[PDB]
Structures are given as C-alpha cells and as structure tokens.
Write an enzyme that holds these catalytic residues in place. Structure first.
Site, short mmCIF file in Angstrom:
data_model
loop_
_atom_site.label_atom_id
_atom_site.label_comp_id
_atom_site.label_asym_id
_atom_site.label_seq_id
_atom_site.Cartn_x
_atom_site.Cartn_y
_atom_site.Cartn_z
N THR A 1 -44.08 23.81 -25.60
CA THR A 1 -43.41 25.22 -24.84
C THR A 1 -44.48 25.27 -23.58
O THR A 1 -43.55 25.59 -22.39
CB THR A 1 -42.99 26.42 -25.85
OG1 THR A 1 -42.28 26.90 -26.63
CG2 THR A 1 -42.99 28.45 -24.83
N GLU B 1 -60.22 33.39 -0.24
CA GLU B 1 -61.25 33.42 0.02
C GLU B 1 -62.33 32.20 -1.14
O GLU B 1 -63.07 31.38 -0.57
CB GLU B 1 -62.06 34.46 -0.57
CG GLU B 1 -61.47 35.63 0.13
CD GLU B 1 -62.00 35.39 1.86
OE1 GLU B 1 -62.88 34.82 2.62
OE2 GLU B 1 -61.67 36.18 2.40
#
Lengths: 439, 432, 85, 85
Positions: free
Chosen positions: A145, A254
């Site tokens: 899955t 960042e």
C-alpha cells in the site's frame, strides 16, 4: 501561512500519523474532544496552532491530514480508538482489496480505482489552506500500500504542483532483519519513483532503533509504540520553527534548499538526540558539545553505516529548547578540527542555526524524560551508498532465475522495468561514488 | 529639515534595527507608549532627524521593515517597543527566501518591490530635504542580501544625490549559517562595489570573542551583539544627532575616508569594552582610549590589521576632554608606529570630538578606520567560491530559477580584479 | 501580466537556447558525448539550430557547429548531407 | 555531458512548444489583447512563431495571429514592426 498537509499511506503511515497528531495535541494542550473544556485550570494552548490544526467558529480543531489505506482493518482499528471524535470519517478512506506487500496490484489493479476520491480530498484540503510549503507523505517500501499507491499518487501530485516542496518518510528494509521477502521487489521500484519524481527523501530502518533502545533505554521487550514515538519526536524537531518562533527561525524551504546539493543526491542522514530513558536523564549533565559530538557516532545513527568510510558534503544543524549560542560556537569550533570526522576537500563549513525557545515536552506513559534541550542532525555523506549496493546485489541475485516474478507478469506489467530500475540504481550509485571522489 | 531615512532588511537586520531604535529611544527619553519623557536640552531640537512631528507631540519612527517571511513582524512587534512603529511599513510576503539570493531577487523581488518603492517615495516627499538612507541588513540569507541591494540600486537610480551607508554582516568560514553562503556573498559583493557609496563590515565571531575575553559574560547571546552594534551606530550618528564643537556628517567622512570608489569598506569599533567587575575600577583618560582604539584586540574584526598598512583613520570622540591630547597622541603614534600606515600620505587620522556625552555613559569614543585587513577575507571568499564553482555544486537551484551561470563568472572576474588592486595598493611604495 | 508573460516566455526559450549556446562555447570541445547524442541522425535535430532567433544565440551556436565539424570527414560532410550549408 | 545538455535542450524545446501554443491560442480572444500585443512589443519575440520548424507551435500561433491581425490595422502593422513579414 506556514501550513502543510500530511499524507499517511499504509498501516505504518497511519500509525505514524496517529503518533504525530497525539504528540501535537498533548504538547499544545489540545483535548481529544476537539474543544477547550479547560475552564477551571488552564494549562496552555494560547499559541499558533494554525500550522496543523484549524479554528472553527465554535472553537473546534480539525486535523489536516490524509489517512488512506487499501485495507479497512487498520481504519477500523483507528476508528474504535479514543480519538475518533477528533478527525472526520471522510478523511479515512477504506478499501475492498489491498496490496499487502505487492506493487503490481496496488499500482495497476487496486490503486488506480481510488484516485478521484483522494484527489478531491486533497484539493479540498489545499483550498481550505492559505499558505502551503510542503507535504508530509508517510508510507513504507515494504508495504505494498505504501509503495504502489504512494508512487501513483505522488506522480500526480508532482505534475499538479511543481512549486510545492515534496518530502518523503518511510522505512528501510534492514539487511540483517526483515519482515517480508518481497521487500526488495517493491523497494527497487519505489526508489526510481522517489528519485526521478521527488525532491527529498528520508530513509530510516528499525534495527538501529532496536540497537539504540536496548543500549540507552535498556528495554528487553520493545514495541512499535516507542518506534513511533521516536519518529514523531524527530518530525516535531524538524518542523519546530513553524509552529513556534525563536532566535533564528528555519522554515521548511530554508533547510530544504541547502539539504539538496544535487537533483540525484537527496538522501540525508537523520540523527536524533538525546535518545534516553527516564533514569538516563537524571544523573547526567547534558550540554551542547557532548550531544553534538555524540550525534556523529555511528551507534546513534538511525542508518547502519560507518561515516568514516565516506565523507560529508552538506550538513544541516538544528536545535530545540534552551540552548546558548556560545555552546553552539564552541561545538562548531571543536568539530571543525576533529580528525576522526571526514569531509570533502572543497566544502570547509556548512550547517544551520535553529534556536527554538520552546523546550520539548513529555508524554505520560512514554519513555522519554524531561530534557531541557534537544538536537537533530541532517547530514549528507556517501558512506550510506552501501545500502543501495546491498539492495542491488539482493535484487540481482533474486532476479537471475526470476523468483516470484510470474505473479507480477500475470498481474500485468512490463518486465524491462526491472532492468530499467537496476540500471538507474547503478547510474545513481556511480554518480554517488563520483561525487565522493575528491581531486 | 535635514533628516535621515532608515531602511530595514533581513531578520537579523530587523532585530538589530529594533535594538537600535530601542537604544536611541531610551537615550533620548521616549516612553514605550509614544510620548516624550526626556529631561535633556538637545533632545528636542534635532529630534526630528529620526522622528516625525505629529499632534500631541507623539513622535513616530522613520523606518521601513522589508521582509519575505511574516514570522518576523510578530516577533519584533510583541516586544516592549514593537507597538510604536508604523504597521504600514511592515511589508512582508507570503513565501520565504530559503536562503536563496537568486530566487528572492527574481521571484520575491518583482511583485513586492513596488509597495516598498511607493512607501519610501511617500516618506521622501513627506520631508523637505534629505541627506542619505541607512539600511541595516545581513548577507546571511535571501531576505537582507537579496532585497537590500535591489532597493539600494533603485534609490541610487532615482536619487543619485544621496548617501548610501550600510552595516551588512560579513561571513566567516569558522562560524557559518548557510551552505550556499559563499555564493550569496559573491553575488552581493558585486552590487556592493558597483552601486553603493560606502559599506561597513560586521562580524559575529569577532564580537563573540571580544565579549568572551573582555566582557566576560556568562551567557552571551544575539541581544548583546545587537546592543553593541546599536551603540556603534549611535556613536557614528551622534556627529549629526548631537552637535558639539567639531561636528561632522556622513558624506564628509565618506569623501575623506574613501580614496577610491572601488574600496569603500571600513572597520568600526568602540573603545570602552570592560567587564562588570571592572566598571568601578577604571581610569578615564586619553591614552587609555587611544590604546583601546589602536589595538587589534578591541577591534571587532575577524582578521589582523597588522598584516597590512593603515590607509585612513577617523577617531570620533563623545565627551568633554580637550583637543591637544588627540593630536599629540596621533602624532606620537605615527612617529612610533611608522610601518603600520601609508608613508606617502601623512596625517591619516581625523579628529572628531562631540561635546555632548551619551546617556548612561560619560566618556565614549568609536573607531572608524579602513585598515589593510579585509584582503584575507576577500581572498578566502574567492578561494572558496572557486572551489565551489569548479564542480558546480549547489547550482541546480539557481539554474532552475532562470538566471544563467555567466553571472558567477563575471562576479569572480570582478572579485579577482578587486583583490589584485587591493594587494597592489597594499604595498604603496614611494617610488621605484 | 499575461502580456508580460507573453514577452517573457518568448525571451525565456530565446535565452534558454542562448545559455545552451554560451555553454557549448566550451561543450563543443568534447566529441564522445556529441557522438553519443548524435547517433540517431541528430544532425536533423541540429538543423533548426540555425533557426536560432537573435545574435545572442547564433553567435556561439556557430562556435558549436565548428567543433562539431572538426571531429572527422563525416561530420564536416554532415553540414552537406544535413542541408545545413 | 553533451547528452544531458541535448536532453535539457529538448525538454525546453517541448515546454516552449506547449507554452507557445497555449498562449497564442489564449491571447487572441479579446480586442484589448489585440491592442496590447500591438503595444507590448511582442512581435520581435513572436517572430520565431513564423520562423521555427515546429508544426504545432506555428500552426496554433499563426492561426491565432490571423485572429490577432484581423481586429485592426494596428497589430498587423506591428507584425511588420516585429520584422515578421
């Protein structure tokens, strides 16, 4: 503003998301009901909870996450829990047939049936949000899955949103111990998808977790709960400057901008510290230099690899709790002159400074103690390329006589992809050693 | 009348500007509310340089906060003095810079730039006549370095007849914060040497060392550094804020301090940096101040001025002492330390004393000089940039933005030209 | 902004080829990858490289075609067989 | 290194194809867009749209241009100014 959407695919992804959400609610004082019933004695909650939760007109908090699974047993297990009054049933989509460690069905004959539903769900969630930066996709390589369905969904998400950050978090099949047998078969297919269609990928395993818990926490019968707790603490430390502020805020962009040196080399090495139990946190003086030095120890790495085999190119430094800049400067001065630590002959320095005023919290019933400050490390080194080498070796020695391949052929797929994935992994490894070679 | 417009860029720039505003408000006697609570004399006449006259005598600050992340405004607003500024000046975007100069300059520097130009033009037209614009930012990020240089270029293009002084923060290989910091520094230096009047060098590592070895602080943080830089700029600007006997101004120094337009960098420094237990045992006199303004130990540079030769020196004093001691001190220093300054130019030291002492301290004196000590920073930056650009690491991020790689080539060419010029002027011989 | 993006996308493909060209100022010196890409009659794909808009691109696209032609007799005859002469 | 170069060249060729087609089809619908494409200076940059070798680019482009130059003398004359004729 700084708001992100979490994606949970597979049983592991669902339980990791549950651990993360419960950690967030306990750390922010969010009650499981969804309201603020604390009208007699307040205990917090006056903060910026908009990053993950949502505020309604009646004072309700609605989680912003995606709990999808091909098997309904996990959904039922979560539904009968004590937090069923927090999320919404529309967010937990069940399924008739599941993959259960299979890529073929879960990628062609199972995952292709439920696409519009989840796409509408995520579109509605994104529309309900104003500022979007990245995604938190939780899946697994061993789970079918979390491999086939995750790949097909991220392939559409990449083409539907190019300006948004695409993260990755899953579990690595340990070379020593393993859960299933066909794990490399799904891994060799998921790696190509996560490499040629994503920006960053975080790779962790379980044997290192077992080693660190038996070495520091000193437990003889471990369980998945502490495994999930460690990952949740890691995730919270990573996204610490988003929910709160500090001296130097480090957002997702960042650090993600610098953590990726090349489009092909985007596999950082995470290391959380201090990973200690209650008694391991009482008679132990904790400073910044010691924990920073310990972070580079291979025993404390979540990936079984010797850093001394290779060298570092890019490093991402983070903090959380009451940390003093002088200690950080002293630690940087210490590590820059350490002969044991190897680094490339071109990059003399690289790291970040994330100062988080909020100290990490504790959980009643967990194993983590009250530590005044935390630290997490995201470095990039070529010494981790051995795992891909071993995976390629295993795939080659499983592909010579085509073991458990007739099932995939009958399900429907083209066999040349195994060769394609093999050659792509070979090229990626070659690039890794070329980068690792200095002048 | 003669006023100075102040500009803000970068989170570090924002915090240091806020600290400077708090320091000047405390020194000039301004309550956190917004009224006036001073008790001095010169704090009412020339107070309009940084403030604006309004009804009820409620002076307002004159500073525009430019940022790309909304998370800085809330931090700087919640402080004891964050409620006095102009919320209209807090122009923030929705997406962060990600420590990218190219991405910030291109993406976050097109649709947001118009608002800040409009507000600065409104502020400029609001006053009668101006002198220059002060911008405090840091090169460590895409916010200060990516935007300040652009705003600097625009204000030069619109109003060429203005002073362009900044206090950008220089990097250091020992203390880093950005992996691509050399790239950003290389890109910013081009605009600094092409489209900027003057620039002051700011290093955090040197300040940390100074406080650790002289101030002897228990837990030094960025607040101490912000206090130090705020005091530095206050000593710099008191030449115009508080007139004395021998007053000076920013363009007079900018002309007398800079021999050539390509070399406009400086080396600031404050004299009385003592420990807490030493404040009650000190001898307030001239030679002590001279020794602390001349030695490299007190200097906030992450380098050694003794490796080269002094080019220009400006000593700005703030107190009530005399005039003879300064000239005799500089004379005997030039006579003794003859191999430390350029022999072809005599009298490289400028005298400046402010008769108005600061608030809270009785004697104060700053050091503004341009010594031959930045060359090592320049050469090491060039070396690290060449090493990075050889195999072209961390370059796909800039390439995906749209700008090419020739910009790095021309930047490093100008870098090599500038350093060659600097070292062939270091050995300024008299003749053949 | 739509008209500006009109201009922008035109200039963007323009400068994309400009940058390929200012790179092939030094890329053209390397023949092994040239042949690796070239094997599939890619001289036809270099045919539109004269359809190259402004001086900023053509200027060094010629410098490319030069070192492309130096590699053997056949690549110098490719400008003939490719109808690029 | 030239192989990846030509790859990047051709994915940017294809994005140029897609963008050129979509924008020529879109911007040729309204009279103010006609006048703006007249005044925006598009046509020196739209010169490749009658210049390049791509079939779909040029077909959608020039069909929209036939829409575009239909509205007024202005756009069609600026097509001359763009040196496209």
């Amino acid at each position: 503003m700084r708001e992100c959407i979490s994606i949970h695919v597979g049983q592991a992804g669902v339980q990791i998301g549950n651990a993360c959400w419960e950690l967030y609610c306990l750390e922010h004082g969010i009650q499981p009901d969804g309201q603020m019933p604390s009208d007699k004695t307040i205990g917090g909650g006056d903060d910026s909870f908009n990053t993950f939760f949502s505020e309604t007109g009646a004072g309700k908090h609605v989680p912003r996450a995606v709990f999808v699974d091909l098997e309904p047993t996990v959904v039922d297990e979560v539904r009968t829990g004590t937090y069923r009054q927090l999320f919404h049933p529309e967010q937990l989509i069940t399924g008739k047939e599941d993959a259960a460690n299979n890529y073929a069905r879960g990628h062609y004959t199972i995952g292709k049936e439920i696409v519009d539903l989840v796409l509408d769900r995520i579109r509605k969630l994104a529309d309900l949000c104003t500022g979007l930066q990245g995604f938190l996709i939780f899946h697994s390589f061993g789970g079918g899955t979390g491999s086939g369905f995750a790949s097909l969904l991220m392939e559409r998400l990449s083409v539907d949103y190019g300006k948004k950050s695409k993260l990755e978090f899953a579990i690595y099949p340990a070379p020593q111990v393993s859960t299933a047998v066909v794990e490399p078969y799904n891994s060799i297919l998921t790696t190509h998808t996560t490499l040629e269609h994503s920006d960053c990928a975080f790779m962790v395993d379980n044997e290192a977790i077992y080693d660190i818990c038996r070495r520091n926490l000193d437990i003889e019968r471990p369980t998945y709960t502490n495994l999930n707790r460690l990952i949740g603490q890691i995730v919270s430390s990573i996204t610490a400057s988003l929910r709160f502020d500090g001296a130097l805020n480090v957002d997702l962009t960042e650090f993600q901008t610098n953590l990726v040196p090349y489009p092909r080399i985007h596999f950082p090495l995470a290391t959380y510290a201090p990973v200690i139990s209650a008694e391991k946190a009482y008679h132990e003086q904790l400073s910044v230099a010691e924990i920073t030095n310990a972070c580079f120890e291979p025993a404390n790495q979540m990936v079984k690899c010797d850093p001394r085999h290779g060298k570092y190119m890019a490093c991402c430094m983070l903090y959380r709790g009451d940390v003093v800049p002088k200690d950080v400067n002293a630690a940087i001065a210490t590590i820059k002159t350490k002969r044991t630590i190897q680094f490339v002959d071109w990059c003399p320095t690289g790291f970040k400074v994330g100062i988080n005023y909020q100290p990490p919290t504790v959980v009643p019933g967990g194993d983590l103690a009250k530590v005044q400050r935390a630290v997490c490390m995201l470095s990039n080194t070529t010494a981790i390329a051995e795992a891909w080498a071993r995976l390629d070796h295993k795939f080659d020695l499983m592909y010579a006589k085509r073991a458990f391949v007739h099932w995939y052929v009958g399900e429907g797929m083209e066999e040349g992809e195994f060769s394609e994935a093999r050659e792509d992994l070979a090229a990626l490894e070659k690039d890794y050693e070329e980068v690792g070679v200095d002048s | 009348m003669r006023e100075i417009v102040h500009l803000q860029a970068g989170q570090c720039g924002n915090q240091i500007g806020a600290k400077f505003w708090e320091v000047i408000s405390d020194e000039h006697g301004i309550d956190p509310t917004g009224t006036y609570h001073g008790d001095s004399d010169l704090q009412l006449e020339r107070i309009n340089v940084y403030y604006n006259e309004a009804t009820g005598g409620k002076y307002v600050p004159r500073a525009v906060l430019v940022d790309l992340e909304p998370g800085t405004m809330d931090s700087v607003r919640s402080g004891p003095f964050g409620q006095i500024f102009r919320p209209d000046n807090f122009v923030f975007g929705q997406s962060g810079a990600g420590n990218n100069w190219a991405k910030g300059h291109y993406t976050e520097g097109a649709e947001l730039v118009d608002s800040v130009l409009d507000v600065v033009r409104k502020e400029a037209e609001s006053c009668d006549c101006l002198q220059g614009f002060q911008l405090t930012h840091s090169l460590g990020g895409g916010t200060g370095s990516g935007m300040g240089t652009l705003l600097i270029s625009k204000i030069r293009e619109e109003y060429p007849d203005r002073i362009m002084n900044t206090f950008s923060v220089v990097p250091s290989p020992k203390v880093s914060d950005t992996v691509v910091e050399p790239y950003n520094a290389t890109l910013s230096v081009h605009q600094l040497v092409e489209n900027t009047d003057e620039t002051y060098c700011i290093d955090n590592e040197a300040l940390y060392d100074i406080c650790f070895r002289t101030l002897k602080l228990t837990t030094p943080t960025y607040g101490d550094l912000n206090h130090l830089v705020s005091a530095t700029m206050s000593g710099v600007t008191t030449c115009l804020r508080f007139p004395g006997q021998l007053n000076a101004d920013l363009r007079k120094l900018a002309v007398n301090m800079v021999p050539f337009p390509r070399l406009h960098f400086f080396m600031p420094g404050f004299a009385p940096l003592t420990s807490r237990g030493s404040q009650q045992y000190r001898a307030l006199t001239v030679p002590e101040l001279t020794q602390q303004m001349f030695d490299a130990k007190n200097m906030m540079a992450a380098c050694d001025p003794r490796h080269g030769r002094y080019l220009t020196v400006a000593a700005v004093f703030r107190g009530r002492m005399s005039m003879k001691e300064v000239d005799e001190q500089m004379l005997n220093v030039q006579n003794k330390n003859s191999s430390y300054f350029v022999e072809w130019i005599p009298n490289n030291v400028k005298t400046a004393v402010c008769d108005i002492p600061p608030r809270g301290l009785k004697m104060s004196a700053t050091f503004i000089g341009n010594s031959t000590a930045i060359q090592e920073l320049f050469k090491r930056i060039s070396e690290q940039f060449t090493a990075m650009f050889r195999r072209k690491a961390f370059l796909h991020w800039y390439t995906g933005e749209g700008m090419d790689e020739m910009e790095f080539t021309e930047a490093e060419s100008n870098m090599n030209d500038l350093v060659s010029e600097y070292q062939q002027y270091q050995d300024a011989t008299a003749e053949e | 902004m739509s008209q500006r993006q009109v201009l922008q996308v035109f200039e963007q493909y323009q400068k994309a080829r400009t940058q390929f060209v200012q790179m092939v100022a030094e890329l053209a010196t390397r023949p092994q990858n040239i042949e690796t890409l070239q094997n599939a009659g890619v001289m036809s794909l270099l045919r539109p490289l004269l359809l190259d808009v402004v001086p900023t691109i053509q200027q060094t696209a010629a410098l490319a075609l030069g070192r492309l032609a130096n590699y053997n007799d056949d690549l110098a005859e490719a400008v003939v067989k490719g109808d690029i002469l």
